[PDB]
Amino acid sequence: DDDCKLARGGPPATIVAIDEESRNGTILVDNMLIKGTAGGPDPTIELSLKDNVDYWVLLDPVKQMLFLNSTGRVLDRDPPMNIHSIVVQVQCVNKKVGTVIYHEVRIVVRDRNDNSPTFKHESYYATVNELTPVGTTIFTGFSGDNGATDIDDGPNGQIEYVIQYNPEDPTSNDTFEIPLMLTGNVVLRKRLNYEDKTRYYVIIQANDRAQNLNERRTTTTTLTVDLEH
Amino acid sequence: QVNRLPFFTNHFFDTYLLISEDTPVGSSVTQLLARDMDNDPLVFGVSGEEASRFFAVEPDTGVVWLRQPLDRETKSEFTVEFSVSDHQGVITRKVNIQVGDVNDNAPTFHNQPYSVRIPENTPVGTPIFIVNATDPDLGAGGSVLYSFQPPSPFFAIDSARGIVTVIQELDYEVTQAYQLTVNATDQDKTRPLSTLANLAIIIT
Ligand SMILES: [Ca+2]
Ligand SMILES: [Ca+2]
Ligand SMILES: [Ca+2]
Ligand SMILES: [Ca+2]
Ligand SMILES: [Ca+2]
Ligand SMILES: [Ca+2]
Ligand SMILES: [Ca+2]
Ligand SMILES: [Cl-]
Numbered sequence: 421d422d423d424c425k426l427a428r429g430g431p432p433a434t435i436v437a438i439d440e441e442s443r444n445g446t447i448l449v450d451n452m453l454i455k456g457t458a459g460g461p462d463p464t465i466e467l468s469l470k471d472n473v474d475y476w477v478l479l480d481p482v483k484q485m486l487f488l489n490s491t492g493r494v495l496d497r498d499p500p501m502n503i504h505s506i507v508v509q510v511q512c513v514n515k516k517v518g519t520v521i522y523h524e525v526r527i528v529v530r531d532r533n534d535n536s537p538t539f540k541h542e543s544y545y546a547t548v549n550e551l552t553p554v555g556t557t558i559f560t561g562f563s564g565d566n567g568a569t570d571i572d573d574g575p576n577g578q579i580e581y582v583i584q585y586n587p588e589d590p591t592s593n594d595t596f597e598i599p600l601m602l603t604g605n606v607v608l609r610k611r612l613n614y615e616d617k618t619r620y621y622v623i624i625q626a627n628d629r630a631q632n633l634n635e636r637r638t639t640t641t642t643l644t645v646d647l648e649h
Numbered sequence: 650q651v652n653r654l655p656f657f658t659n660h661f662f663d664t665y666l667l668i669s670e671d672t673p674v675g676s677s678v679t680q681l682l683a684r685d686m687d688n689d690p691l692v693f694g695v696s697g698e699e700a701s702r703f704f705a706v707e708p709d710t711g712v713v714w715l716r717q718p719l720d721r722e723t724k725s726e727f728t729v730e731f732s733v734s735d736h737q738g739v740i741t742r743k744v745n746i747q748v749g750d751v752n753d754n755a756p757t758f759h760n761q762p763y764s765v766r767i768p769e770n771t772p773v774g775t776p777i778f779i780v781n782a783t784d785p786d787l788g789a790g791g792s793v794l795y796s797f798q799p800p801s802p803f804f805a806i807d808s809a810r811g812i813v814t815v816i817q818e819l820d821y822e823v824t825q826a827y828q829l830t831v832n833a834t835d836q837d838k839t840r841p842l843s844t845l846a847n848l849a850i851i852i853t
Contacts, residue, residue, distance in 0.1 A: 425789050425836070432750050432788035433725075437664055505726060505745075518809030521792045521836075526726070528665050528745050574743045602738065631656075 423456030423464040424512040424521040434510075437528035440497035444490045448477065448527055452484035454512055466513040470522065477508045477525070486510075486525065497529050498571045505529055533576040536637035537568040537626040544624075544643045546606070550614040555607060558596070559643060562604035568626035568639060575629040579604070584623040584640070592620040596645065612647055620645040652737045655685035662742055669749040670721040678704070681711030681731060689735035696730040696741060704729065721750040722785050752790040752837040755844040756782040763831070763848045765813075769821040778813040780806070780846065782833035790837040798832045804850065806831065813848070821852050 426432070436449055456465035459482035467481035476495070478487045486508075488495065497503055510523040546559040561567070562581060570577045581604030583593045595610045606622065622643040630636045659682050668678050681693045693711040695701050705714050711733075727746040732739050758780065765778045784791045795811040797804065803817045804827070811833075827850045834843035 424792075425838070431669075432786070432790060433747075435665070435667070435747055437745075504728070514809075518807070519792060519794070519836075520809070521789055522787075524787050526747065528747070530663075574741070 421516075423516070424514040424519055425455050426453060426523070427455045428453040433524045433526055435526045435528070437530055438488070438495075439530045440503070440532050441494050441534060442488055442490070444488060446488040447485060448488055449486040449525065452486070452510055452523060454484055454510070454523060456512070456514070458482050458484070464515055466511075466515060468511050470509040470511050472508045473506075476506050477527075479510065495529065497531050497573070498535060503529055531573045531576055533572055533628065533630040533635050533637060535571050535576075537570045537579055537628055537639040539568045539626065539639060539641045540566050541641075543641055545646075546643060547646045547648050548608065548612065550612045550647050550649060552608055552612060554609060554611060557605050557607050558645065559606035561643075567604055568641075570628050570637075572628065575631065578602075578629040580627050580629060582625050582627065584625045586621055586623045589621040591617070592622045592645075595620055596622050598624070606643065614647050614649050618647045652689075652735065653686040654738045654740055655683045655689070655691055655733050655735055656740065657731070657733060657742050658682045658684055659744075662744055665745040665747050667747050667749055668715075668719060669751060670719040671751045671753070672715055672719060674715055674718055677712050677714050679713050681706065681713060681733065683711070683733040683740075685735050687735065689737075692734045692736070694732040694734070694739075696732055700727065700729040703727065706731070719748050721748045721787070722754065724748065725750075750787040750790065752786050752835065752840050752842060754784055754786050754791075754835075755842040756784040756793045756833040756835055758782045758831075758833060758844065758846045761846055763846060764851070765849070766851045766853055767815070767819075768853050769819045771815050771819060773815055773818065775815045776812050777804075777815060777850070778848065780811040780813070780831050780833070780848065782811070782844065782846075784833075784835045784842075786835060786837070790835050792836045793833050794836060796832050796834075798830045798845070801827065801829055803827065804829065819852055824852065826851050 458467045469479050478489045506527040508525045512521045544561050548558050568579050580601040586592050596606050597609045625640050627636050627638040692708045693706045695706050725748040730743050732741045782793050794808045795806045805814050805816045829848040831846045831848050
């Protein structure tokens with residue numbers, strides 16, 4: 421009869437989503453809603469998983485429930501593991517007819533902001549001529565991937581650079597600015613004077629662009645600016 | 650007043666966008682929504698070589714249209730990078746696109762032509778032949794059942810396994826050859842598709 425066909429309406433594939441790094445035992449699909457019973461006195465169907473690559477999914481055939489199996493590992497969307505989605509088949513065999521139906525399950529794995537920016541170097545350096553006029557770009561060392569980078573995806577992986585106040589060099593964040601935070605190029609804002617001050621310690625904080633401000637992650641570096649003469 | 654950058658607000662960026670593979674070329678599949686607190690004029694785009702082959706975006710409205718047919722049998726998941734710009738900043742965001750299956754393939758027989766010689770004294774219940782057909786749609790849509798059209802009083806076919814059995818004593822003198830038509834159908838609830846094949850049974 422109809423055992424092994426979907427009991428639910430809708431399309432053939434059972435698509436769900438889940439955050440990376442979800443707890444072992446997370447319920448991926450509460451009920452597959454396949455016609456027939458795999459349990460009880462007189463089961464009309466058999467249910468098992470196919471193409472369960474690396475056994476991320478576990479099936480309870482009687483409940484028709486699918487679970488994440490991550491004991492001793494994490495479901496990681498980021499490099500180096502790069503798990504963007506999991507695809508399994510719920511094979512259903514009709515015991516009476518012999519019919520076989522594969523119920524495809526697709527699990528979209530969502531990125532978490534679980535990584536912070538890292539700067540390529542531990543600190544950065546520029547030399548500036550005392551007569552350099554205001555408005556001049558004096559540091560472009562965050563171009564390429566020589567600045568901060570972040571292994572998350574989309575906005576969770578994009579970078580903004582913001583000069584921070586430095587209590588050890590109070591004037592440094594007045595004397596230099598970053599007008600375009602997405603680039604992190606530093607521009608001279610006030611006239612220099614080699615007779616008064618020869619070094620600035622500029623604190624630059626890189627943040628990622630997570631949707632919500634309070635899940636943003638940040639990292640700090642120092643740009644040391646020496647005047648020449 | 651430093652520029653405030655725009656941001657996408659579509660709920661799908663948090664989950665995924667489902668698009669049926671029978672969506673026609675030129676149909677609108679969604680509309681990008683963005684907000685800029687400056688209320689700057691916004692320009693919408695798609696980025697990526699793969700993505701821009703399949704979708705186009707109206708730059709002012711953000712209506713996303715399909716450029717060429719989706720095919721669930723070839724590719725059922727895409728990642729698409731959309732962009733929104735206030736002409737001081739390009740913001741990008743990715744969406745996972747899931748292709749919905751329809752029943753769009755009939756079963757295909759293999760190993761044809763089908764032809765088998767059997768002796769007149771072949772017992773009832775004897776397996777004599779196995780037909781095979783496959784069907785790449787999902788689920789019930791891709792699950793093949795076999796039958797004879799019409800059924801034969803001399804031969805049966807197992808609906809699931811495609812094994813042909815003798816169900817009646819043969820008689821060379823009565824009939825020397827049968828030409829049976831094997832139907833292979835998928836089981837799609839509302840739009841089943843089937844395909845026919847000839848089976849010759851030659852008596853000796
Ligand atoms: Ca991760
Ligand atoms: Ca992540
Ligand atoms: Ca991040
Ligand atoms: Ca703006
Ligand atoms: Ca197709
Ligand atoms: Ca089909
Ligand atoms: Ca299809
Ligand atoms: Cl589907």
